[PDB]
Design a protein around this ligand. Structure first.
Ligand SMILES: NC(=O)c1ccc[n+]([C@@H]2O[C@H](COP(=O)([O-])OP(=O)(O)OC[C@H]3O[C@@H](n4cnc5c(N)ncnc54)[C@H](O)[C@@H]3O)[C@@H](O)[C@H]2O)c1
Ligand SMILES: *C(=O)C(C)(C)CSCCCCCCCCCCCC
Ligand SMILES: [Zn+2]
Lengths: 294, 7
């Protein structure tokens, strides 16, 4: 096997070996909760808390395409309620910036729509926004498809005006993938190529339940180590549906679970790699610069 | 149509 032990220390030693050249990150809502964006998983602060004001037929409807097409207003009202006062990427986001700066980042596949990867300095070429993004929006009329930046979309969201296209007056929709919509072609094109040559999978802040994103962990070669940094031990096979990640069996050979906050796990990994000062300085500098432009 | 987002 490629890891000398199934620990964070073993992953760090592998990362600094000649074998580890190309890292893929798979991230979800857990990497942005410390930036103030709720996940689904938390019962106290998660998205399903405080949804009865919207009078939905069922809670999940506000994230489903068929409901959005019938009544876009609840989703835009929720977007206003959750729009953050500042966009400060987390320690975890800036750990991925270090992977980019050091030439190790092949790709970040993200389920997040909050743009924080881009704010942290990942480029479009580095990213597969598997569920799209608020970064850009488009008129929904097939004959128009006028594009609008987030500055435009934010103003429509905060004035509580359902965004309409200035050219044709159709609805303007953030470039996100609702439940029930097809994922972007870029997701499948990158998935079919990137996982031929990946040396390490870093999975952070996701429960690995939404498909087809969750299936990405099975696309790596069988020898590729997989490190999960997450509050809970996600990605294991379900004992009923099985009739995945193998952290604990007698056959376990490549999967490591670090259970805790993504910011703390990334800091711990950075420290093992000799990057702790770099990461601390980067986060403090970037946050101070964001404040200086506010 | 490409595979769809599902929970
Ligand atoms: N920020 C966003 O863009 C955002 C926010 C909420 C939901 N979503 C959507 O939710 C769907 C499900 O995705 P998911 O699996 O990422 O979300 P999820 O809520 O189902 O799972 C989040 C996971 O992160 C863990 N977690 C939360 N905060 C953490 C922290 N600070 N450190 C470590 N672990 C932490 C939780 O324990 C859980 O396992 C996706 O389709 C995604 O688009 C996106
Ligand atoms: C799939 O799971 C989708 C893409 C539908 C995401 S689930 C809803 C996530 C909402 C998080 C908060 C977003 C509102 C404000 C964000 C503003 C970003 C610029
Ligand atoms: Zn239009």
């Amino acid at each position: 096997r490629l890891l000398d032990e199934l620990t964070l220390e073993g992953v760090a030693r592998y990362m600094q070996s000649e074998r580890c050249r190309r890292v893929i990150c798979l991230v979800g809502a857990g990497i942005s909760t410390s930036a103030g964006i709720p996940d689904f998983r938390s019962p106290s602060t998660g998205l399903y808390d405080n949804l009865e004001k919207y009078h939905l037929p069922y809670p999940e409807a506000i994230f489903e395409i068929s409901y959005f097409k019938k009544h876009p207003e609840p989703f835009f009202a929720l977007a206003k309620e959750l729009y953050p006062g500042q966009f400060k990427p987390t320690i975890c986001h800036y750990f991925m910036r270090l992977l980019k700066d050091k030439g190790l980042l092949l790709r970040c596949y993200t389920q997040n729509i909050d743009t924080l990867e881009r704010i942290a300095g990942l480029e479009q070429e580095d990213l597969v926004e598997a569920h799209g993004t608020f970064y850009t929006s488009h008129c929904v009329s097939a004959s128009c498809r006028h594009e609008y930046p987030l500055s435009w979309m934010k103003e429509k969201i905060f004035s509580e005006v359902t965004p309409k296209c200035e050219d044709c007056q159709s609805l303007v929709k953030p470039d996100i993938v609702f439940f029930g919509e097809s994922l972007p072609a870029r997701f499948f094109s990158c998935m079919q190529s990137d996982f031929l040559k990946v040396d390490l999978l870093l999975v952070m802040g996701t429960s690995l339940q939404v498909q087809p994103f969750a299936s990405l962990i099975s696309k790596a070669p069988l020898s590729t180590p997989r490190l999960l940094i997450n509050k809970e031990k996600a990605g294991q096979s379900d004992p009923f549906l099985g009739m995945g990640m193998d952290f604990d069996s007698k056959k376990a050979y490549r999967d490591v679970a670090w259970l805790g906050e993504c910011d703390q796990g990334c800091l711990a990994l950075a420290e093992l790699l000799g990057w702790k000062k770099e990461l601390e300085d980067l986060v403090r500098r970037e946050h101070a610069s964001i404040d200086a432009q506010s | 149509a490409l595979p769809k987002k599902y929970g």
